[PDB]
Structure formats: C-alpha cells, structure tokens
Amino acid sequence: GDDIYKAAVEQLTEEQKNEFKAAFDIFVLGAEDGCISTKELGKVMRMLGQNPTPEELQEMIDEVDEDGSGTVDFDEFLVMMVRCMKDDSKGAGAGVRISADAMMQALLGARAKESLDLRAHLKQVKKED
C-alpha cells in the first residue's frame, strides 16, 4: 500500500501482465471461484520451500484488500507481485521473503531455474564517487 508499488505496477504493460495472467491460473489451484485465498496462498508460498507465519497469510491479503472481500484477484495480486520484487532487494527481512523470480519456478516449473539464474548474480552498484 505505497506509491513505490502503484508506480511500478503502473509501468507494467500487457506483455508483463500476460505472464501474471497465466500464473493466477495455477495460483488459484483448488479455489472454487478461481480466487486466491489464505488457505491456498499459504501452500503456494510454502511450496517454494518456506515456513512463514499463519498471520502473514492474512496480512499479505489485507495489504491488497481494497474491496475488503477477503480474497486476492488478478488486479490485487498485480500489486502484490510488485512488492515482491522490492522485498529481497531490501535484504534482512524475517526468515521468509517471497520473490517474483523465485515463485516463478514454482508455477512455470523446475526448468525455469536452469532457464534463468539472474537471481544468483545479484548485483547493483553504480559506484559514482
């Protein structure tokens, strides 16, 4: 719920949205109305190999809960993913920081890992001086 996120998602185009559109399909695996609830949200996040807290499941949605329905949609999730990208970069943040690049392999598959390994590099120093 910040400008840094809304500003990022705003830049995203159909090309990028398309990738997310397919993700939701798997993310809502089991859901009745193809929605992302806390029940599944916890399995999808833990599927990557994490053991976060139960409260986080709700807090995560609360952040993107505008309609106050209690579920994350394609539009809501759009903002969530934006935060993910700016979650690992921060560094030092609890023992579970979901990432858009990491979660990808979860939906796309294991091949996604071998396909791209940019995360491994991790570098960003302009060095002005």
Q: Does 38 contact Ca ion by CB under 5 A? A: no
Dist CA 47 CA 114 (whole Å): 18
- List CB contacts of 2: < 8 A, sequence separation 6 or more: none
Q: Per-residue x/- marks for Ca ion, 50-69, CB under 5 A?
A: ---------------x-x-x
Amino acid 123 reads K
Listed residue (18, 65, 17, 5) closest to 41, CA to CA: 65
> Residue with the closest Cβ to Ca ion?
69
Between 55 and 67, whose beta carbon lies closer to Ca ion?
67
Residue 65 is assigned to a ligand binding site: yes
Between 60 and 104, whose beta carbon lies closer to Ca ion?
60
Write out the binding residues for Ca ion, residues 72-111 only, by CB under 5 A. Answer: none
| Neighbour tally for 72: CB within 10 Å | 25
Dist CA 53 CA 35 (whole Å): 21
Among 41, 71, 77, 98, binds Ca ion (CB under 5 A): 71
Between 71 and 105, whose beta carbon lies closer to Ca ion?
71
Residue 69 is assigned to a ligand binding site: yes
| Contact of 79 with 5, CB cutoff 8 Å | yes
| Contact of 14 with 94, CB cutoff 8 Å | no
Q: How many residues bind Ca ion (CB under 5 A)?
A: 4
Between 25 and 67, whose beta carbon lies closer to Ca ion?
67
Tell me the binding residues. Answer: 65, 67, 69, 71, 76
Residues in touch with Ca ion (CB under 5 A)? 65, 67, 69, 71
